[PDB]
Design a protein around this nucleic acid. Structure first.
Lengths: 162, 176, 176, 161
DNA sequence: TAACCCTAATTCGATAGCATATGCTTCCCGTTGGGTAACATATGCTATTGAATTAGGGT
DNA sequence: ACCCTAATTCAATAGCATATGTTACCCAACGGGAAGCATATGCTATCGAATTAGGGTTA
């Protein structure tokens, strides 16, 4: 089972985005934190503009979700996107090409970082931990997404809670 | 005859019939990644391709690698979805992703910032483009059309995306 | 009511409408050069203003010479008149010539060429501006706007006009 | 009485816009314009068949403007003429607010479409000389060369029948 | 001797009627678009969990 | 030399939730049409009043 070793699931609240540090995610975050410690760089820009992004992709949803949870704990000064699936690539050699809407089962998640320098550092760290993983986690891949305009993440989220 | 056609022992807007039998969810067969070219979508596609014609550019790359892309965001889920469908019809040589929600941006001022895992209601959409030059042209066309369109559509914002090593989309398999 | 005057006129839901009465016909209190803001023209003006906003430029000059000009020809008289009225609302610092008819162009082949006095049905209106800088932006806005329009509006063609001497419009001293 | 007791044209002549004949008076005006334009010989319309040049005319009086237009047509059939129209009002002088863009004016105007800018300039100079020599409101007539960067595409269609 | 009439010629105004176009206004009806009830289709979140794999490690 | 025994780390593994895909209709806005009205050209005629000389005095 799960929560009770017998329930094997249920409604535990924790709505999408309500992630919490757990031994597994904390360990992943700890490893990523050590890799981030490798390079000393700022995370929050003065203008606080998310002009850089860490596009994680490939691997497996189980590996990606754990990496995403760990990345959040490892980097409090950043933003993460819910796992999404890449669209189909191209038909091999000759044959009918897939439609633009056509998407593959491959999952992915991009990490919004206001600074490009730290975005590069995070991408390197993610690769290091992903490579270290001997499980089907090394399959995970990441690419830098440089937003020239700079993705305008909603700079709200006030102390709305009473 | 989903409650709509004239007369009939049902419908509603035209003819007799109390109705109640209208757009009843039952799965339209088409799965995620495959959708029909709706007249509105192709109509939007016509405007997009018209603005694309304003700046004729290559629509594909010899490598075929989607190393370039564009980021669509803001506006509204319905508007973003309609734009995505129209973009697919207007730009056949592109790869589109299902609409997703952006994370919450930095909290205003020194106020406690949102966790690096929060999910803002803002929805975003990605367009993979092998040709970077076409990416800016497409974004400019989207901006011009969105600007000419009403405020809700005008709310939609688009910015070109650059992948450092590109995105290795999985090789598509032609169905048996 | 005022919008629907008559039991069965061409005004209103047309309920119990035998035909039409005091609907669109009638002599309004208006004259050439005398016009009022119209929501249709207002919406057109709003789009033009947004396109002009893309490149904010000088719209008036110290000399105020109407050396700058534009040639809005083609499309349909209805579309041309609507665009002209909207341009007036969008651009206060401008002068709109009454809609006129272009003459026929060279007759293709050796076919008898049309006379200079010969005038084609094609209608066109010219806009006077104090600075050409705004003229080009205005023309670009009009062209971009008509392109989005699937109506004959897209058929309308606009080319900036240049007056070396600069048309000397009569000073508006008459009022008071 | 269209010639006779009153001897003053009255009724429907059966003529239509563009049906301008070689009126001897207009032909004399055309003769003057012809002599003036004859001084500077230049192709009126090139093989491109593109009306990129224009000869905006205005000022003076509708009678003077129409007479000049009729003469211009007889003098130059290659060019294309436009029906007389009313210019819009100009900037309001003094602190008084300027008039609306729609606001027009009594001043009438007509532009001469030409494929050659050089000939368009020659036509302006010739018209100006004729306007100057005529001390009537014809002298009040004002003319300017309205060049078209793109080149107005006057419907290049053969007049059928 | 030039400077006068004068007195009609003159030629462009300044008139004389028709019947296309235009300008402002008004109803309107396609028209484009967002938007929403309803199957299927994705992941967030927790938790076990089990397992193939990574060793273990001194007998 | 390899035997249980960790073990382990994270995928997988459920039940919850939520968020998106692909389509049917409803109501949305907006701009080209249209109709009637002064409103004004084209063309041509004829016709007016300055011109525009014509000329013939006289000294």
């Amino acid at each position: 089972g799960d929560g009770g070793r017998r329930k094997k699931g249920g409604w535990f609240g924790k709505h999408r985005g309500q992630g919490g540090s757990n031994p597994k995610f904390e360990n992943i975050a700890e490893g990523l934190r050590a890799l981030l410690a490798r390079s000393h760089v700022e995370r929050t820009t003065d203008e606080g503009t998310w002009v850089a992004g860490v596009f994680v992709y490939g691997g497996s949803k189980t590996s990606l979700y754990n990496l995403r949870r760990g990345t959040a704990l490892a980097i409090p000064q950043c933003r993460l996107t819910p796992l999404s699936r890449l669209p189909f690539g191209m038909a091999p050699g000759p044959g009918p090409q897939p439609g633009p809407l056509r998407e593959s089962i491959v999952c992915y998640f991009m990490v919004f970082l206001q600074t490009h320098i730290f975005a590069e550092v995070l991408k390197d760290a993610i690769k290091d931990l992903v490579m270290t993983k001997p499980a089907p986690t090394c399959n995970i891949r990441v690419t830098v997404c440089s937003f020239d305009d700079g993705v305008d993440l909603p700079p709200w989220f006030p102390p709305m809670v009473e």
